[PDB]
Design a protein around this nucleic acid. Structure first.
Ligand SMILES: Cc1cn([C@H]2C[C@H](O)[C@@H](COP(=O)(O)OP(=O)(O)OP(=O)(O)O)O2)c(=O)[nH]c1=O
Ligand SMILES: *Nc1ccc2c(c1)Cc1ccccc1-2
Ligand SMILES: [Ca+2]
Ligand SMILES: [Ca+2]
Ligand SMILES: [Ca+2]
Length: 341
DNA sequence: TTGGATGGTAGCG
DNA sequence: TAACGCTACCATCCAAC
């Protein structure tokens, strides 16, 4: 098994640098402005120059400006980045039929049948890198290993503009030495739970009672980690199929007034159905985020597809359920469609 | 006894 | 002050039997 993973470098900010080369080598921050007030919202990403000052994905814009006033702050232009991504993903298709688009800027290629060994794999990764740079002026990082997880870890190690093979011997080192927090799928919550069991490395999972690990992190995560630690993870590269399409918005003022919330809702519905394009959903979920940032959702599943017109009145009822079942005011309202025909 | 629907949690792009 | 889009999983719980 040989897996090649491509991960585009500081993607949104890098596109902005291609579009405006005067930006290169200076801090750039790409921002999701929420509408509420001036500079309200969060950072989507930033180039490496900006990151040296602590500006990264997810922090409040106002906060980024306290540590880095000097940078270029740009609004996130999602459609534009998606156009570049779509073009890159079509280039990568030329290297293997077995490809899994993981996100806007990640793809896994199964090249087990295209190359004989890691040496040939490395050469392919360089060809891929060079072709993307020539055709799109975009640098990417390539990770190569025996399965998807270690391929992704290899890319993390070589970021930005890198290429790294993690061979059989280094897989063994990583099982022994990689902080378990650095394994894909392990965030703060799981990592903290792991520390309480004395688990700091993948290898620590081998010598714990399976039922004890399961009771702390659940069956799926327990099985995942043990499989990796046993050097047995071998999940196939497969075509991802979109399962849900949804849209969420921050309202100008927090509200409990149905007639005030409704236009925001209807807007999210129109935006979702537009993206759905020929796909027909059998389920609808409305989500509200209250003043104190709690999340509430109400949904309904039908035995048949939901027309755009039906989605309107169905979403209203779901919002009314939330408003009857939660007395707090609402700050954000969203809708999502799923269970496609 | 069991299995889709339900709403929530965790991770992450 | 704290975006927003998506997958996977988890507990729980009610109607089929
Ligand atoms: C992590 C993250 C990414 N994104 C978007 C912007 C990123 O450019 C894009 C890809 O995410 P990443 O691959 O996580 O980040 P990146 O490409 O900007 O930086 P890196 O060099 O470290 O790989 O997804 C968000 O909108 N919100 C987020 O919280
Ligand atoms: N980004 C994003 C957009 C819409 C929705 C979420 C995330 C979660 C959720 C839950 C229910 C309805 C809509 C959404
Ligand atoms: Ca990236
Ligand atoms: Ca990525
Ligand atoms: Ca982590």
């Amino acid at each position: 098994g040989i897996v090649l993973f491509v991960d585009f470098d500081y993607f949104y900010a890098q596109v902005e640098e291609v579009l405006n080369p005067s930006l290169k080598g200076k801090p750039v921050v790409v921002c999701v402005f929420s509408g509420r007030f001036e500079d309200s919202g969060a950072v989507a990403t930033a180039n490496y120059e900006a990151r040296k000052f602590g500006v990264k994905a997810g922090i409040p814009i106002v906060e980024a400006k306290k540590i880095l006033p000097n940078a270029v702050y740009l609004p996130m232009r999602k459609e534009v980045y998606q156009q570049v991504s779509s073009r890159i993903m079509n280039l990568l298709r030329e290297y293997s039929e077995k490809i899994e688009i993981a996100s806007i800027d990640e793809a896994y290629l199964d090249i087990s049948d295209k190359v004989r060994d890691y040496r040939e794999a490395y050469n392919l990764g360089l060809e891929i890198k060079n072709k993307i740079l020539e055709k799109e002026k975009i640098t990417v990082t390539v990770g190569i290993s025996k399965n998807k997880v270690f391929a992704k870890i290899a890319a993390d190690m070589a970021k930005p503009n890198g290429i790294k093979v993690i061979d059989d011997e280094e897989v063994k080192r990583l099982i022994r030495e990689l902080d378990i927090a650095d394994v894909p799928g392990i965030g703060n919550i799981t990592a903290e739970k792991l520390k309480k069991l004395g688990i700091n490395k993948l290898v620590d999972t081998l010598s714990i009672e399976f039922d004890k690990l399961k009771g702390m992190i659940g069956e799926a995560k327990a099985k995942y980690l043990i499989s990796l630690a046993r050097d047995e993870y071998n999940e196939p590269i497969r075509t991802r199929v979109r399962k849900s399409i949804g849209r969420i918005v921050t309202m100008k003022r927090n509200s409990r007034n149905l007639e005030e919330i409704k236009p925001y809702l209807f807007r999210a519905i129109e935006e979702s159905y537009y993206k759905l394009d020929k796909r027909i959903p059998k389920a609808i979920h409305v989500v509200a985020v209250t003043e104190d940032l709690d999340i509430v959702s109400r949904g309904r599943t039908f035995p048949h597809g939901i027309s755009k017109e039906t989605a309107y009145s169905e979403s209203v009822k779901l919002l009314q359920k939330i408003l009857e079942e939660d007395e707090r005011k609402i700050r954000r309202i969203g809708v999502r469609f799923s269970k496609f025909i």
